[PDB]
Amino acid sequence: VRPVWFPGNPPPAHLDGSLAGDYGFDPLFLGQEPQTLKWYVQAELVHGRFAMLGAAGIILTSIGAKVGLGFPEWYDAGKVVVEKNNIDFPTLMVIQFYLMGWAETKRWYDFKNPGSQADGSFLGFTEEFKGLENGYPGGRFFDPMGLSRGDAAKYQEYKQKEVKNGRLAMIACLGFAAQYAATGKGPLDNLADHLADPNHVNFATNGVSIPIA
Amino acid sequence: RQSWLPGSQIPAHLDTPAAQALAGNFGFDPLGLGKDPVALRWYQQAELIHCRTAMAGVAGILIPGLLTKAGALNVPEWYDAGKVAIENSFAPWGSLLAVQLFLCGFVEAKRWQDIRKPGSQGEPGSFLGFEASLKGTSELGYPGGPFDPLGLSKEADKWADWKLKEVKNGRLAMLAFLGFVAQKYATGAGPVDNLAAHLKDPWHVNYATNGVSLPFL
Amino acid sequence: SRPLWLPGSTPPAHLKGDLPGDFGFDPLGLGANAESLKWFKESELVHSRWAMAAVAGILVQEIVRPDVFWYNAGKEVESPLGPLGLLAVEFFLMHWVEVRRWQDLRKPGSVDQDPIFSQYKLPPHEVGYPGGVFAPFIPGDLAELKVKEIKNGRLAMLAFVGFVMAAQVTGKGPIAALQEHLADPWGTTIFSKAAVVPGQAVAPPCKIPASVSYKGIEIPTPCFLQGLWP
Amino acid sequence: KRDAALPSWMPGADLPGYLNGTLPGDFGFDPLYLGQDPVKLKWYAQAELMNARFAMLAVAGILVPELLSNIGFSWPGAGVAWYDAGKFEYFAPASSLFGVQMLLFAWVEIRRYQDFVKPGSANQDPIFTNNKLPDGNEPGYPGGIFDPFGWSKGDIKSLKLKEIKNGRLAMLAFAGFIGQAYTTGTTPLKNLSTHLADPWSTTVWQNDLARL
Ligand code: CHL
Ligand code: CHL
Numbered sequence: 001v002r003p004v005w006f007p008g009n010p011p012p013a014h015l016d017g018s019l020a021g022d023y024g025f026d027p028l029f030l031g032q033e034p035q036t037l038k039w040y041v042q043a044e045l046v047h048g049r050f051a052m053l054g055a056a057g058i059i060l061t062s063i064g065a066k067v068g069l070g071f072p073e074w075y076d077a078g079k080v081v082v083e084k085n086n087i088d089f090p091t092l093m094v095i096q097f098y099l100m101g102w103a104e105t106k107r108w109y110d111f112k113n114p115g116s117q118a119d120g121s122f123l124g125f126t127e128e129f130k131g132l133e134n135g136y137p138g139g140r141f142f143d144p145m146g147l148s149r150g151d152a153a154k155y156q157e158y159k160q161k162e163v164k165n166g167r168l169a170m171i172a173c174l175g176f177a178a179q180y181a182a183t184g185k186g187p188l189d190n191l192a193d194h195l196a197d198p199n200h201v202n203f204a205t206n207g208v209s210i211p212i213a
Numbered sequence: 214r215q216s217w218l219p220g221s222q223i224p225a226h227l228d229t230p231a232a233q234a235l236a237g238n239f240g241f242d243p244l245g246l247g248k249d250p251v252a253l254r255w256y257q258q259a260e261l262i263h264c265r266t267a268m269a270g271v272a273g274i275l276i277p278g279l280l281t282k283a284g285a286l287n288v289p290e291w292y293d294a295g296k297v298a299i300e301n302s303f304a305p306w307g308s309l310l311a312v313q314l315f316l317c318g319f320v321e322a323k324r325w326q327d328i329r330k331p332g333s334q335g336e337p338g339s340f341l342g343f344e345a346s347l348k349g350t351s352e353l354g355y356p357g358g359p360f361d362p363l364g365l366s367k368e369a370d371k372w373a374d375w376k377l378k379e380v381k382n383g384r385l386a387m388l389a390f391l392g393f394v395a396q397k398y399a400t401g402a403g404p405v406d407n408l409a410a411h412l413k414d415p416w417h418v419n420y421a422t423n424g425v426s427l428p429f430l
Numbered sequence: 431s432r433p434l435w436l437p438g439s440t441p442p443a444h445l446k447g448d449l450p451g452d453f454g455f456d457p458l459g460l461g462a463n464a465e466s467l468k469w470f471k472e473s474e475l476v477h478s479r480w481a482m483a484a485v486a487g488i489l490v491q492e493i494v495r496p497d498v499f500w501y502n503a504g505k506e507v508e509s510p511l512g513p514l515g516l517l518a519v520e521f522f523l524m525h526w527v528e529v530r531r532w533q534d535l536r537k538p539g540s541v542d543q544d545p546i547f548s549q550y551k552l553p554p555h556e557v558g559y560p561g562g563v564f565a566p567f568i569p570g571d572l573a574e575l576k577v578k579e580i581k582n583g584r585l586a587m588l589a590f591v592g593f594v595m596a597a598q599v600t601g602k603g604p605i606a607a608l609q610e611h612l613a614d615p616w617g618t619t620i621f622s623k624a625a626v627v628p629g630q631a632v633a634p635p636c637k638i639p640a641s642v643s644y645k646g647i648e649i650p651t652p653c654f655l656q657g658l659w660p
Numbered sequence: 661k662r663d664a665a666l667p668s669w670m671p672g673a674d675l676p677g678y679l680n681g682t683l684p685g686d687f688g689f690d691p692l693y694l695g696q697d698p699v700k701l702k703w704y705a706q707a708e709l710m711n712a713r714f715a716m717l718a719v720a721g722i723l724v725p726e727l728l729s730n731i732g733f734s735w736p737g738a739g740v741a742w743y744d745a746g747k748f749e750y751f752a753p754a755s756s757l758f759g760v761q762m763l764l765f766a767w768v769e770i771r772r773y774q775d776f777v778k779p780g781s782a783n784q785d786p787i788f789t790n791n792k793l794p795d796g797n798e799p800g801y802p803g804g805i806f807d808p809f810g811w812s813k814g815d816i817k818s819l820k821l822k823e824i825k826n827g828r829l830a831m832l833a834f835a836g837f838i839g840q841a842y843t844t845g846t847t848p849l850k851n852l853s854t855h856l857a858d859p860w861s862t863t864v865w866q867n868d869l870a871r872l
């Protein structure tokens with residue numbers, strides 16, 4: 001019925017299409033156990049959401065570099081920001097783990113005991129941390145515009161859109177790393193080269209990806 | 214039901230009515246040291262003595278430290294005061310400590326026998342008529358009587374509130390002293406001097422840059 | 431049944447024409463939630479009302495005071511009250527006005543009474559449409575007037591954004607830019623000064639200075655999203 | 661749960677039930693819920709009066725002496741900043757005066773506390789037993805010899821409200837003296853003159869930005 005990653009192959013039993021972005025792709029049966037599948041569903045969303053922020057940030061700053069606004073490449077921004085602004089790297093790293101540790105520990109114990117973070121313990125907030133589904137916090141803090149509290153049909157459509165752009169972003173972030181390692185240039189520097197001579201400038205001719213070439 | 218970590222499973226032994234009668238019970242016992250009811254009764258006394266001793270000691274390091282900086286006093290660093298005091302002293306530190314162990318040992322011994330047999334120090338004739346006031350109260354670790362001159366423990370409404378304040382300030386004081394010890398080795402300066410340095414440049418003067426705490430970085 | 435932004439289309443379910451200026455335009459469904467629409471209703475009026483006043487001011491400034499560029503009016507203006515003296519009055523006065531308006535949005539009918547004078551009070555009204563002292567004179571039907579207000583207001587909001595991007599690109603005022611368009615309409619469109627094709631991208635230069643020196647301090651003055659310009 | 665008829669610090673805001681207008685100056689202001697417990701709120705009620713009444717005296721004792729000096733009135737203590745009165749030399753050393761202060765205050769304060777603990781129990785003169793305060797006095801409002809002019813016999817409720825309003829403003833003023841003196845480095849009335857000289861360019865934003 002519903003489309004699958006490999007046309008003609010029946011989907012796995014444990015993937016019934018209820019989840020967003022379900023194409024029955026689980027060749028290694030990593031999520032056969034129902035409780036483990038909940039953990040990975042949220043792991044995919046967190047991975048996808050971070051990748052979308054990463055890809056958008058890398059793309060935008062790369063446009064700034066090409067246009068000449070002075071932005072550094074994503075693989076040099078860390079060094080430039082610290083030196084130019086005179087920031088102690090170990091202090092910045094520690095601050096990150098306090099803020100991430102607090103925010104991400106709360107997400108951890110909401111997964112273990114759903115609704116536990118909405119008991120008013122944290123500064124008296126009792127409804128912004130209740131959670132709607134697994135991986136979808138909802139609420140008037142994480143969803144201020146209430147797009148998850150309006151139409152039910154369109155909210156399900158967005159869940160499909162979120163996961164697929166997340167998976168695409170995850171692949172893109174792997175492309176940025178692989179392209180930098182093979183080429184040593186920025187993302188849009190590679191795109192400009194390909195558009196110049198697509199036939200003679202690509203991975204099959206970089207001298208790295210296909211060593212036998 | 215306040216807990217140190219929302220959404221975690223409170224240990225069963227800490228949810229019993231006897232356990233919840235203890236001040237400062239936030240369900241924090243990950244290592245299960247209080248599973249045995251007899252042990253928890255003993256560890257509660259240890260916390261109270263550590264709490265009260267730490268508060269007195271920290272007050273003796275912090276308040277003199279601030280007044281010394283303000284210029285109202287001249288007291289050496291808490292880690293030097295021992296050497297300074299013994300110089301202009303009537304006794305060597307060996308004699309001073311030996312007396313301390315007799316007096317503290319005698320007083321501690323009476324407290325010890327009350328933990329084993331609550332109210333047993335009011336044995337008629339045991340002391341020179343003063344045993345009557347050494348019976349303590351119905352709650353272990355809260356002697357009262359001569360130890361409560363102002364009678365602040367006779368107000369039932371405020372009783373639970375008072376005990377919570379003591380344990381909270383006591384736990385904070387215990388951590389403060391551990392910070393004094395760690396900050397002396399880490400920074401080689403006084404507690405108040407460390408605070409002054411942090412406030413001057415918080416983002417560059419902290420444990421992340423002291424060159425000790427994070428050896429890998 | 432009523433005119434729509436795209437004739438022949440079906441308006442979203444949450445839009446039914448009750449509000450003024452309701453032409454059924456909500457492709458993203460931001461107004462689906464009832465409470466969210468109530469807040470977004472207030473912000474549209476406030477945004478539009480500010481824009482209409484701002485757009486009118488910029489046009490009047492250029493006619494009355496052609497030399498001064500409305501973009502540079504921040505530093506050009508000189509007054510005895512000084513920079514921080516003006517800001518202090520603005521902050522406290524705006525904080526009072528905005529909080530009272532905000533309170534009515536949360537709990538309507540609670541901030542109608544005049545604090546100082548007891549006798550004066552605001553008659554019952556709808557959120558975002560205060561009456562009484564604020565509306566001494568009404569030309570005609572309110573229902574028609576509300577539609578007129580939003581339609582002019584929505585146009586003004588677009589108009590102001592036009593001033594900013596035209597000011598940043600052409601480095602001129604609104605009327606001055608228009609005179610340039612009438613002089614050479616073919617050679618002055620955004621298409622005739624910018625273009626991007628595979629392999630090449632040409633964008634106009636930001637004509638606003640990178641930084642502004644104002645009374646011993648440097649104020650950054652960046653062109654809005656200059657890196658994504660066509 | 662607080663009724664809407666009572667004055668509110670923030671019109672149209674829900675306010676705590678336990679602030680029901682009994683105390684003077686009850687505008688329902690308690691965002692931190694400090695006074696939620698009735699026992700604690702009983703203590704805080706007296707603390708506000710004590711901190712307020714001393715503040716009113718202190719502020720009066722910091723402005724009037726400086727105001728007279730500017731007018732030209734001459735007395736040996738003239739021209740001394742409120743934060744330099746301690747250094748000034750008097751007929752007796754500061755330590756001796758301090759010792760007398762605590763002994764005198766120990767008697768009156770414990771007398772005041774005894775009434776608070778058990779109202780009406782400290783209304784009799786220990787020496788001249790004939791003397792006595794009226795039996796209807798409440799904690800914080802002794803009356804009797806403390807009200808020789810009988811003002812308390814009038815609209816008492818309004819007077820209590822007026823006292824706390826002036827008192828609360830006085831407490832804020834004293835905090836202004838410490839903040840202003842610590843920052844500006846000059847006497848309070850000097851700061852007012854500077855502000856009146858150029859109100860627009862003499863805000864705390866102007867003053868503090870210049871320093872850093
Ligand atoms: C017995 C001690 C004890 C321990 C070990 C913990 C441990 C924890 N508590 Mg805590 N609690 C403890 C006692 C208590 N907790 C609580 C109530 C809570 C709540 C309500 C919550 C926690 C949470 C947490 C977790 C935070 C994880 C993290 O990354 O934090 C990172 C830590 C911080 C961000 C704060 C500390 C930062 C830094 C060390 C101090 C900086 C101070 C400066 C003034 C900073 C100024 C900076 C400004 C100026 C820019 C962690 C497992 C949170 C959690 O994860 O819940 C699921 C949580 O929500 N605890 C109470 C009150 C009943 C306690 C009473 O004793
Ligand atoms: C609706 C408000 C508003 C807008 C849209 C502008 C817009 C502009 N001003 Mg103007 N101003 C505004 C209000 C004011 N300006 C000034 C004073 C100035 C000066 C002195 C200068 C400008 C300049 C400019 C231009 C470039 C600004 C820039 O890139 O800043 C980049 C961004 C910043 C500098 C900071 C951005 C702040 C942030 C958006 C809001 C911060 C909120 C506050 C923390 C909240 C507290 C304050 C209170 C009032 C709410 C631009 C046309 C410059 C110019 O002429 O360039 C050619 C210039 O030199 N403005 C005052 C008087 C105090 C204002 C009062 O409301």
Ligand code: CHL
Pocket residue numbers: 285742743744745746747754757758761
């Ligand atoms: C409401 C209570 C209260 C407050 C807020 C102050 C506030 C102040 N008193 Mg004052 N006092 C108060 C009650 C009293 N004072 C004094 C007696 C003094 C004296 C004798 C002095 C002050 C001084 C000071 C200042 C301390 C800061 C400073 O410059 O240190 C720096 C300190 C100095 C430069 C003084 C150095 C010489 C001095 C003889 C050394 C000994 C000082 C004492 C330790 C001060 C003890 C004050 C305590 C009891 C409040 C400050 C303005 C000092 C002052 O006016 O400095 C300009 C000062 O010398 N107060 C008495 C006793 C009658 C009080 C009784 O309640």
Ligand code: CLA
Pocket residue numbers: 480483484486487488490491494495498503504506507509
């Ligand atoms: C959003 C509104 C707004 C803002 C922020 C500004 C800002 C500015 N205008 Mg502009 N202006 C506006 C609207 C605005 N104008 C409108 C609608 C008109 C048409 C009437 C004008 C007509 C105008 C002229 C003719 C001039 C300016 C000038 C100026 C500059 C100096 C102002 C000054 O010195 O005032 C000093 C202030 C006073 C003398 C007292 C003003 C008291 C007013 C009238 C009270 C109004 C209260 C009322 C409730 C407001 C309702 C609308 C509001 C909520 C938006 C400054 C950049 C000057 C300039 O170009 O300088 C380079 C200049 O010459 N403006």
Ligand code: CLA
Pocket residue numbers: 829832833835836837839840843844851852854855862863864865867868
């Ligand atoms: C009783 C209240 C009160 C009053 C009337 C003043 C008056 C003054 N203060 Mg002071 N101040 C106060 C409280 C007060 N202050 C408090 C509580 C603090 C501690 C935070 C300070 C800290 C302070 C500093 C650091 C400075 C001043 C300065 C000033 C001047 C005005 C310019 C300024 O920056 O103000 C800033 C002051 C405030 C924003 C006050 C906020 C808090 C009060 C309680 C608000 C009351 C509002 C209410 C409607 C009543 C208004 C007054 C009333 C008589 C009508 C002026 C002489 C400046 C000066 O000396 O310039 C030469 C200056 O540098 N004040």
Ligand SMILES: CC(/C=C/C=C(C)/C=C/[C@@]12O[C@]1(C)C[C@@H](O)CC2(C)C)=C\C=C\C=C(C)\C=C\C=C(C)\C=C\[C@@]12O[C@]1(C)C[C@@H](O)CC2(C)C
Pocket residue numbers: 241242243244245246263266267269270271272273274290291292293294295387388390391
């Ligand atoms: C008593 C004390 C300090 C006393 C200090 C004194 C007298 C100082 C005196 C002096 O300084 C003066 C005044 C002046 C100086 O000149 C001289 C000296 C002499 C130096 C500190 C205790 C300090 C005690 C500390 C820090 C104890 C911390 C315990 C922790 C964190 C336990 C945690 C858990 O056990 C739980 C609760 C439950 C389990 O399930 C899980 C785990 C995690 C195992």
